Amino acid sequence: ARHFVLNTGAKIPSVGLGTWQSDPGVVGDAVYAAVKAGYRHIDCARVYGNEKEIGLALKKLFEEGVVKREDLFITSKLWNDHHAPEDVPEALNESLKDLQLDYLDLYLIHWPFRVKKGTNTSPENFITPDIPATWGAMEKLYDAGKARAIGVSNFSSKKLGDLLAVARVPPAVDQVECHPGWQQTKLHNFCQSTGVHLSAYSPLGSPGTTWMNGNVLKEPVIISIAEKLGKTPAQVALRWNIQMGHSVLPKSTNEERIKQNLDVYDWSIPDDLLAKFSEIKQARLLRGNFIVNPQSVYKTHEELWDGE
Ligand SMILES: NC(=O)C1=CN([C@@H]2O[C@H](COP(=O)(O)OP(=O)(O)OC[C@H]3O[C@@H](n4cnc5c(N)ncnc54)[C@H](OP(=O)(O)O)[C@@H]3O)[C@@H](O)[C@H]2O)C=CC1
């Protein structure tokens, strides 16, 4: 259970190191510690502003002979301002430059949302998405082998369905918020029915993010199962996702928590304790406030998420 198989045939390691909010000065030693500890999957994005420092950590690991390039699964994301079909390859090239890599294992459309190239998220800069024309350009990256798998992030079942109808290369991954607090059963189903892999971002509910109301590790049901099974609350939360057939992208810069989050393979959650999860109140923590707006295509929360 140390990996899942994507629709491309590629194995995606079921635990990756998240690097959202990993500062340029700490992220390098975090990636290093993670890989040394057995991680084979790093989740990155242009907009995280730390890809240069992840690249220095990867080049250290290779030259030090901890791993070779082929042992690692490296993910990055196309930001909202590079959706125009002519801008997509520059975006991938910018991230390959910073990571100092020949290819990405996974390249994702970060949001089903577009702004003018080189502009900030402000309504004046909003441009109607053309996901087919962006996906069209993402396919050319996949053809050339520069992105060995392509996929999307923050797509509902509907938006994922609409892309699959027009795709020549089907999305390999839909990366979404998914944890005990927000279980995404519908999309989980739609993904297994379509052969799309569901990858769980904020798998601990992103408790370090002051503007998200994460308290997943404090839920009575998770604290219980941890105590019952002699595992930490984090361990339980992550294991739940892995038993659902989702990969998890736990972020840490603390060597010990990095180690603990990989320790989700040798042990299981009994079916009894797996039943105890629908006793958990459901709330989406990352609502996409920043792109729900009167001048947005998404005038409502329900419009962004298609009721989900
Ligand atoms: N739009 C998208 O596609 C999105 C993608 N992502 C990706 O998913 C990743 C993971 O989600 P993220 O929102 O970062 O939050 P997570 O759910 O991964 O939680 C991270 C927080 O939990 C702490 N933590 C880590 N390990 C443990 C542990 N074992 N016990 C207790 N606390 C722990 C971290 O602190 P510390 O570092 O001190 O250990 C940090 O404050 C992101 O980092 C990013 O790579 C996430 C958000 C959006």
In terms of DSSP bridges, do strands 173-177 and 197-201 run parallel, antiparallel, or are they unpaired? parallel
Torsion of CA 160, 216, 51, 290, to 10 degrees: 60
Q: Is the dihedral of CA 39, 12, 74, 207 positive or negative?
A: negative
CA pair distance 269, 266, nearest whole angstrom: 11
Ligand 1 touching residue 260 (CB < 6 A): yes
Ligand 1 touching residue 18 (CB < 6 A): yes
Are the C-beta atoms of residues 72 and 58 closer than 8 Å to each other?
yes
> Exposed, middle or buried: residue 181 (CB in 10 Å: 0-12, 13-18, 19+)?
buried
CA pair distance 223, 225, nearest whole angstrom: 6
Q: Which of 274, 254, 12, 298 minimizes the C-alpha distance to 155? A: 298
Residue type present at position 68:
K
Ligand 1 touching residue 29 (CB < 6 A): no
Residue type present at position 253:
T
For residue 143, give both structure tokens.
């053809």
- Residue 19 annotated as lining a ligand binding site: yes
Across 26-57, b (16+ Cβ under 10 Å) vs e yields ebbebbbbbbebebbbbbbbbbbebbebbbbb
> Which residues are registered as beta bridge partners of 76?
107
Are the C-beta atoms of residues 200 and 176 closer than 8 Å to each other?
yes
CA pair distance 176, 152, nearest whole angstrom: 9
Across 133-172, b (16+ Cβ under 10 Å) vs e yields ebbebbbbbbeeebbbbbbbbbbbbebbebbeeebebbbb
> Exposed, middle or buried: residue 17 (CB in 10 Å: 0-12, 13-18, 19+)?
buried
Residue 91, domain extent: 1-308
Beta-strand (E) ranges in 154-257? 173-177, 197-201, 247-248
**Residue 210 φ/ψ region, left for φ over 0, alpha for ψ in the -120 to 50 degree band, beta for the rest:** alpha
**Which residue carries 């990405």 as its tokens?**
104
The separation between the first and the last C-alpha atoms of the chain, rounded to the nearest angstrom, is 28
For this experimental structure, what is the resolution in angstroms?
Answer: 1.9
Count Cβ atoms below 10 Å from residue 67 Cβ, excluding itself: 15
The DSSP H or E segment spanning 59 is helix 51-63
Residue type present at position 106:
L
Q: How many domains does the chain have?
A: 1
**Which residue carries 């797509």 as its tokens?**
155
> Exposed, middle or buried: residue 7 (CB in 10 Å: 0-12, 13-18, 19+)?
middle
In terms of DSSP bridges, do strands 147-153 and 173-177 run parallel, antiparallel, or are they unpaired? parallel
For residue 161, give every residue at least 6 positions away whose Cβ sits within 8 Å of its Cβ, in sequence order, or none. Answer: 190, 194
- Residue 104 annotated as lining a ligand binding site: no
Q: Tell me the backbone φ, ψ of residue 15, rounded to 5 degrees.
A: -125, 125
Are the C-beta atoms of residues 276 and 180 closer than 8 Å to each other?
no
CA pair distance 105, 97, nearest whole angstrom: 15
CA pair distance 103, 149, nearest whole angstrom: 10
User: What residue owns the CA closest to ligand 1's atom 32?
Assistant: 234
User: Cα 137–119–110 angle (5° rounding)?
Assistant: 45
User: What residue owns the CA closest to ligand 1's atom 18?
Assistant: 250
Ligand 1 touching residue 43 (CB < 6 A): yes
User: Cα 21–32–204 angle (5° rounding)?
Assistant: 40
Total residue count of the chain as it appears in this document: 308
107 in catalytic set: no
